[PDB]
Amino acid sequence: TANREAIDMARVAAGAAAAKLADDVVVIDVSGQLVITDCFVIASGSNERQVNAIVDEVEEKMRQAGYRPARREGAREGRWTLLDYRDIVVHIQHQDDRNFAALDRLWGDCPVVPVD
Amino acid sequence: TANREAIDMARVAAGAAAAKLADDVVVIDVSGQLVITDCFVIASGSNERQVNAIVDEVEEKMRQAGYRPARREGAREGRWTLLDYRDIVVHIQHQDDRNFAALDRLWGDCPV
Ligand SMILES: [Mg+2]
Ligand SMILES: [Mg+2]
Ligand SMILES: [Mg+2]
């Protein structure tokens, strides 16, 4: 399964998104699929303000956890942001833009990490 | 349009993939679309071991040209490997998995 250190990072990220009332907050164990990243963290906002508040909360809480800033990515015209912390990767998106079948297609065979 | 520092990185990464006999090597300018990444370099290997060697070639010359180490990722079965250099992302894939349709609906308007 996923390394304990990676799960702890995921816990911090998911707790930050939950603190800003994100929807779809799930930690995916991708340790059996990928060679580097162990946890994928999904989160969604109902508006773009919230999406960005979730993004900033995750970064601020990850900094407090002692980690270096994520390598970031997003679409200039899109409403998503990708945060790469290596052991984990965080993906935050406006719920209206999400493709949920595509998510399940990609990670449907991966265990959910009950992180609470 | 795409960065000088990125084009000269894509040049190196694509040439390296060329030196180790990759197929369907493409440099895609995504600078118009993305915030951070400026270019993608996609390539195919005929098999998992060729994908492995292609990655080696790319990483070897990128280090030689004094570039930052890649943030790597890969499928555990070696079907694909990705190297993130920030300014460019290199995507090497087993030709059987290369979906050119999905590429088109997504980086089709980008110069290639
Ligand atoms: Mg792992
Ligand atoms: Mg750019
Ligand atoms: Mg190697």
Question: Is position A116 within any domain?
Answer: no
Rounded to a whole number of angstroms, the distance from the CA of B55 to the nearest CA of chain A is: 14
Q: What angle do CA B48, A42, B102 make, to 5 degrees?
A: 45
How far is C-alpha A89 from the geometric centre of its chain's CA atoms?
Answer: 6
Question: Is position A14 within any domain?
Answer: yes
Chain B residues in contact with A73 (beta carbon < 8 A)? 34-37
How many domains, chain B?
1
What is the b/e burial string over B74-111, where b = at least 16 CB atoms within 10 angstroms of the residue's CB?
A: bbeebbbbbbbbbbbbbbbbbeeebeeeebeeebeebe
Question: Is position A75 within any domain?
Answer: yes
The CATH number assigned to the domain holding A48 equals 3.30.460.10
- How was this structure obtained? X-ray
Rounded to a whole number of angstroms, the distance from the CA of B87 to the nearest CA of chain A is: 11
**What is d(CA B66, CA A109) in angstroms, rounded to the nearest whole number?**
40
Query: In Å, what resolution does this model reach?
Result: 2.1
Among B56, B98, B103, B47, smallest CA distance to B77 is for: B47
Nearest to B74 among A35, A77, A86 (CB): A35
Nearest to A37 among B33, B37, B73 (CB): B73
Which domain range does residue B101 map to? 1-111
Do residues B45 and B53 lie in contact, with contact meaning Cβ atoms separated by under 8 Å? yes
Is B9 exposed, middle or buried, given 0-12, 13-18 or 19+ CB atoms closer than 10 A? buried
